[PDB]
């Protein structure tokens, strides 16, 4: 999270850290007791490693009462996702068991109505990703309020040049942005999850490259099928 500030500890109970060999790899969102939503490209260069989901965390290094590291029972990427495309960049992780819920661990409701978040709407994005251009990752959870950018502005040649589909959404990126390590993380508009970060190899905090988020509402039937 670039140009943001530290999140109040445990104020986002749905926040998860998708880990590879005990190191933060991607953001994640607890959507059901045993299921975490993240991005498919997160698992791309893992193959050998121990994939785990850390819940009720604020600090990645420091012990906290609520912090519990969970093993992964099942990894369900979207069936149509693959390595060469930003399309369908969603991943459903099944925890070793149902999550121990409490004040710091609780699932988040996701947008079911397939209609765009109005341009200008202020949304909240959190994650343990890079905070500057030097690649510095934070110890504690960071967040930033971002205005939703309309698809037409986002599709300009200066920006994403037509790459923004109806299943993707945009947010402003001028010196306040999602970055490397924030992928799989949540984009929340009015307490409801609207998008899952899909950063990739996009430069961050540059007004010329707006932030890209997968619209959860577009994948309503698929999430229900995996969770049922």
């Amino acid at each position, epitope marked *: 999270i670039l140009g943001g500030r530290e999140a109040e500890a445990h104020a986002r109970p749905y926040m998860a850290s998708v880990q590879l060999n005990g190191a933060h790899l991607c953001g994640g969102v607890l959507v059901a007791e045993q299921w975490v939503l993240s991005a498919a490209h997160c698992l791309e260069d893992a193959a050998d490693g121990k994939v785990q989901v850390l819940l009720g965390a604020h600090s990645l290094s420091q012990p906290e009462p609520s912090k519990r590291l969970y093993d992964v029972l099942r990894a369900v990427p979207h069936p149509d996702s693959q390595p060469d495309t930003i399309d369908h960049d969603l991943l459903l992780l099944q925890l070793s068991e149902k999550a121990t819920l409490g004040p710091a661990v609780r699932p988040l409701p996701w947008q079911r109505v397939d209609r765009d978040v109005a341009p200008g709407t202020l949304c909240d994005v959190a994650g343990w990703g890079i905070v500057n251009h030097a690649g510095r990752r934070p110890d504690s959870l960071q967040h930033v309020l971002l205005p939703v950018l309309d698809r037409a502005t986002c599709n*300009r040649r200066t920006h994403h040049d037509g790459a923004i589909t109806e299943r993707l959404m945009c947010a402003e990126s001028n010196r306040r942005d999602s970055c490397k390590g924030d992928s799989g993380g949540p984009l929340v508009c009015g307490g409801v999850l609207e998008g899952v970060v899909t950063s990739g190899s996009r430069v961050c905090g540059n007004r*010329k490259k707006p932030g890209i988020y997968t619209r959860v509402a577009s994948y309503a039937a698929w999430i229900d099928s995996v969770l049922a």
Partner: antibody
Amino acid sequence: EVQLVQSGPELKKPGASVKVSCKASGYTFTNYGMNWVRQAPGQGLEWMGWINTYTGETTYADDFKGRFVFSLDTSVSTAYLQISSLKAEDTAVYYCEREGGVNNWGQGTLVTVSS
Amino acid sequence: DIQVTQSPSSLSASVGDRVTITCITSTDIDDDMNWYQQKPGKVPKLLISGGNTLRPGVPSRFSGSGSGTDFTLTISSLQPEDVATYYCLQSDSLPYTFGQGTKVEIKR
């Protein structure tokens, strides 16, 4: 496939106004904005401005502020250019260019301003 | 509004020659330079987009270079069909801005 089809040539008297249409097909009209370009006879291309097809917001190049208005009709996926208080110097080919993706242009519209 | 200065106004070269056209912006624009080709009675054709990206169905003899302020369009081996007016367009921010154009003729 993507198509941008503009209305036919028009002759207008000085002081009158003109409305040029740019009918878009083969893509989601609101996913891409529309640019307007003018080419006076034997002159260079002039970027007039843009219209955001999702929000209706407009940005005009300095030379084009005032007498030039971009508008939309989302129901028919059409972008419009309205030029008021026409003068001899407005005699030009007016193009619409879809902003972003595989680059697409309308065929142009010759507007002649004469008595 | 960002200003662009295209050069030269016109040139003449033989088949096989190398054509060099330049555009200088009033500010640092990064990679956001475009090049268009316009044949006599035809609509403009985008040849090169930002980052000096060649467009589909554009011959490889066309190439772009430069960053920030100083941009160049190169036609490595001038062909008869290349006779046209060439325009650069800066797309850093709105409003976008065209160069004055360069008319390219063939010396035969």
